[PDB]
Design a protein around this ligand. Sequence first.
Ligand SMILES: Cc1cc(/C=C/C#N)cc(C)c1Nc1ccnc(Nc2ccc(C#N)cc2)n1
Ligand SMILES: CCOC(=O)c1cnn2ccccc12
Lengths: 556, 412
Amino acid sequence: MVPISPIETVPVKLKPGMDGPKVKQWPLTEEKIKALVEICTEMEKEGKISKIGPENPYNTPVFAIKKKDSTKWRKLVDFRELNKRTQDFWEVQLGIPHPAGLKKKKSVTVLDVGDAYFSVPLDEDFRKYTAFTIPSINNETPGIRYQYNVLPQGWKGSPAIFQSSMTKILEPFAAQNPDIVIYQYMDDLYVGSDLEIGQHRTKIEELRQHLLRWGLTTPDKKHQKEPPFLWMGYELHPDKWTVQPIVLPEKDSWTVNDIQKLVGKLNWASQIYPGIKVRQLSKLLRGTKALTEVIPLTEEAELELAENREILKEPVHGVYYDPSKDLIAEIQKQGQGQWTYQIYQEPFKNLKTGKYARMRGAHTNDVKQLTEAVQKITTESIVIWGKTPKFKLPIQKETWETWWTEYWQATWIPEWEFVNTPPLVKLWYQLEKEPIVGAETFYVDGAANRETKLGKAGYVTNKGRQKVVPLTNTTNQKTELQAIYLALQDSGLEVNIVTDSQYALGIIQAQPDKSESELVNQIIEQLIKKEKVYLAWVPAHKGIGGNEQVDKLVSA
Amino acid sequence: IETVPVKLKPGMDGPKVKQWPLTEEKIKALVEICTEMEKEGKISKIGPENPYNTPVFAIKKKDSTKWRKLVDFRELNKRTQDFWEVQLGIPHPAGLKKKKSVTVLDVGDAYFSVPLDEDFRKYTAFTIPSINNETPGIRYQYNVLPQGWKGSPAIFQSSMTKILEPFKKQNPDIVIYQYMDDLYVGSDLEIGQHRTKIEELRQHLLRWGLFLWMGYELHPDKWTVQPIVLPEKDSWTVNDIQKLVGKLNWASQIYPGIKVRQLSKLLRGTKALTEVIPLTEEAELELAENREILKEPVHGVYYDPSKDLIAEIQKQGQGQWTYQIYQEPFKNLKTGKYARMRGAHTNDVKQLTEAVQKITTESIVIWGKTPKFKLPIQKETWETWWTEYWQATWIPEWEFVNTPPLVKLWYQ
Ligand SMILES: Cc1cc(/C=C/C#N)cc(C)c1Nc1ccnc(Nc2ccc(C#N)cc2)n1
Ligand SMILES: CCOC(=O)c1cnn2ccccc12
């Protein structure tokens, strides 16, 4: 015999204070028992399981299930209880590669490593916890007891330990062959390269020889899997990638479950198909959670759906990453807090696309949302390519400069250039830094009775202009905003406004261009019409002229 | 050799903290660094039976061609036992902040000389990710005292003592203070020979066994503060008086005796914001009395070592930043202002990151601990960029301020 290298076992423990499973075996029909005995006899002769004595206290239930509409049986060991009691592991494979970060390959070959999959030894001290019992015919003898010597299917640590063991085996091969890439998933081993075909085939034979060191045999008859590959919802081709087919169903009536599936498909599609929008469709999913409920689609949701159908009418593919070229990210505003982007290297060939939606909030503006979209794309790009793309953004350099220098928060976006591609992000208003000479000064206030909801809002000015409006179903905060609104509505193009409202100052200092609040929106619309606005704050109830006079008016 | 038993605090598991995305250049740097540490026995590869993780990244200190590995042990540090075992802790030296020059050395490499307790090593697990997760992340744990872990200066302390003993007996006036991977060495000497004294110090460490050559020069005796000051004007507009009354109203929360009544009367009627108002005699007296009040220290201000320090920062524009360090609202232990450049003129977030580092340094020098920051930045913006600008070997805790503070204008 040719000596083979053993696979070193990973030491495994139960969670602290926990013991192994003891779970009753349910009775089985005589047929299932005969089938399990046969199955286990075979497994036992190839060393996967071993018979154990009566001393082992542990048990996990075993079942006999069927293949598809035919005669044969398969053993299923239900590890749910042992899994609850098993320690956590580190899984090498989690956070799968994105196709857009892959490199084009001339050849990709697939090798069958299914025999390794079932051959990794289990830590000797942990085997006892894997004990199971085939019930006896008629229950007239002790059940036959076995435990696992190898990683069981269904056990919590099997994927992590298999991945780690396979990694350790492949590592020297990968390290000493920098001219190939390798990827391993379950029973398949993939090798890509740019090598001349003769060299590529040789590499494969060398890998097969390498694996033989551990006794892992790869069938000589060549794999029936060749590119393109269906993997993780994608289609990988040697020179391009895409998402597997996205077909949007026709229906006269839509259900919560139908809408969730639609949105799911659209989100998946959005990583390649440019301009996909989910806003109005995800909107129908709000706060319901009865999966059978039929929701009439709004006209807005119908428009969105039809827009998506056009985008999805024919296949679109992404290209792979070329490390020798700059990555460029271009972003467009779509409206309603929706943003879309494309990442490319050469014009007209995208690596991938995607979307960003505005965060839930009372007030917002386009510059903040664009900034957020940029940071999200930046982080995604670091994950996929390990570098920040150069940005093409629909905002003028002068607009950005005015924004960040005056914004109360630190803010930054990385290297970028303006692309003139409407709609452009702009500043809709900017407040003055100093009081305006020659502009009328409005002292505003509002107040409300917390009990009855009655209130007043108003202003008095240095020219003796005055207004007080009675209000119903209002609050102090709303009256304070109403007072600012009135001053804006009644003043000329340049105005000084004096308020005591810390609430209003906080909102206006956040520079919203859009609000959940109707009143804030009306204030924004008025600010947009002004040439100059200076907003001054003073403390309440201090004896400040024009402030009392209006405070007294609005109180009662 | 002589391993100190270390434990997590009761009822706590090890850190599982996600590794954040790293750039290609940082990954390459870390692969090179870790390959060498592994050869030197400082770290070892680990298997899937270790679930734990702490994030790692790489930095470049000021004026250097070499990358430095930086592990963010913040979670492990919270979860690690306080050390009462032998030492009850050092009283923080109060003279350090009074020294004319304080140089900061990175001594962390010395820690690698001490083996880490075998039972605790697993909690130091970290991962070097690969771009696009195309290859399995490389998993390691420490075999020795890691840089950045709060336990390292504790366990190494008896070694550091012996090392510095001849330097201390020979230079009894020089103050040496250790915080994490840093040694802070103060003196009143002329800068030329201060630099010789620290170089003399480096040799003791260099001679013993084995970025030490670097030094970071501070002059804490020249560090300033920011008392509340009021404008001195010949003509006051309505707007000027409104801003003054606003600022005094704010100050009256800090200083009880402050009065606005006479000033608040000055504006009488509703006048144009830009109109000039002559001060009444009563108003001038009040303003004068307020000025004198603001020259005195704040009442009932005391540092409590058992409470967190909180640091607030305001962006003032044109590269200017103000900050306050306190424990309780309105009792400020330190205030300050940075009007400065150091690159960053077109980058706000770099400026803020440098401010955070400077404030944390001041905090360590004065109180021997880092404060908890309230940062005027959106979380996603900070989290994306701060590691690009970070030159320090420690990292403080932070929270984010999403509502603009009205008080920014009064620290201006
Ligand atoms: C992640 C991955 C999945 C599969 C396969 C998964 C499956 N099923 C196969 C390989 C080789 C890889 N790994 C890498 C690494 C770097 N570039 C590439 N490029 C690349 C991969 C496949 C095709 C094709 N056709 C083209 C280029 N693949
Ligand atoms: C067990 C999973 O292994 C891999 O997918 C893999 C991809 N590149 N690579 C390099 C060395 C070892 C494993 C791998």
